[PDB]
């Protein structure tokens, strides 16, 4: 998937 820009 297209990346999640949150802090994970």
């Amino acid at each position, epitope marked *: *998937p*297209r990346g*999640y*820009p*949150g*802090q*994970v």
Partner: antibody, heavy 116, light 110 residues
Framework: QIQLVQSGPEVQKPGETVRISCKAS????????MQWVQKMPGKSLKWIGW????????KYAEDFKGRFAFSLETSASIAYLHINNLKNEDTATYFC?????????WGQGTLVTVSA | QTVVTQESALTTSPGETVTLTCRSS?????????ANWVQEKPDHLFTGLIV???NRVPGVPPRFSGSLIGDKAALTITGAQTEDEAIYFC?????????FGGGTKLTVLG
């Protein structure tokens, strides 16, 4: 065990400010973002934004930008939600929830009632 | 507007496979939407169940799983139990915003 514990219920007048705390334990605070969510009475949930716990950089939903702000006390593993210039419509239960992606562990919620 | 919709309410007997769905008004749900499923019990006790479409939150019972079904996100409870009577909310990361569904009241007949 990962736990998020929020401060108690608040009753405030319109125009005032409320501050809600969210104390995290069971994991290293700076390794996951913290999100905030609003649930107005009898309605579904709205995302307020998140704050990066390593850099302190917040991201705010457009519908909350302005009167709603996030801060950290990192050394104590506490995240805060501040709401300024309170409006009657801010009356809701507010939740902190840890990343992620999204909303993995949830605080117990904090009821805020805004009334004159 | 991005509107996320869920079944209003579903009723099941214990032991059945029940599937809840989560649709976007603006397009297909894909793994790029990092679908989340959360459970609310009384009162406003929220538990995260699934994140990132299909990642079970550690400690959540094995009967919960997430997937995609057609154009929608899905939560499957394989063998519903009476403790699963709750309201289930999905959230989608859609156009770089978290948007929540309206919740599904699930009754698991006790």
């Amino acid at each position: 065990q990962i736990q998020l514990v929020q401060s108690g219920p608040e009753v405030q007048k319109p125009g005032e400010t409320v501050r809600i705390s969210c104390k995290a334990s069971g994991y290293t605070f700076t390794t996951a973002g913290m999100q905030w969510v609003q649930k107005m009475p009898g309605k579904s949930l709205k995302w307020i934004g998140w704050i990066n716990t390593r850099s302190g950089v917040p991201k705010y939903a457009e519908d909350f930008k302005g009167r709603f702000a996030f801060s950290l006390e990192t050394s104590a593993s506490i995240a805060y939600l501040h709401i300024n210039n309170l409006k009657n419509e801010d009356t809701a239960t507010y939740f902190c929830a840890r990343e992620g992606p999204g909303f993995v562990y949830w605080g117990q919620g904090t009821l805020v009632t805004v009334s004159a | 507007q991005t509107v996320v919709t869920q079944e209003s309410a579903l009723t099941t007997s214990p032991g059945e496979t029940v599937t809840l769905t989560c649709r976007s008004s603006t397009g297909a749900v894909t793994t790029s939407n990092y679908a989340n499923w959360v459970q609310e019990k009384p009162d406003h006790l929220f538990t995260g169940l699934i994140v990132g479409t299909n990642n079970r939150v550690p400690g959540v019972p094995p009967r919960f799983s997430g997937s995609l079904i057609g154009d929608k996100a899905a939560l499957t409870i394989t063998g519903a139990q009476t403790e699963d009577e709750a309201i289930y909310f999905c959230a989608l990361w859609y156009s770089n915003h978290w948007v929540f569904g309206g919740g599904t009241k699930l009754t698991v007949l006790g």
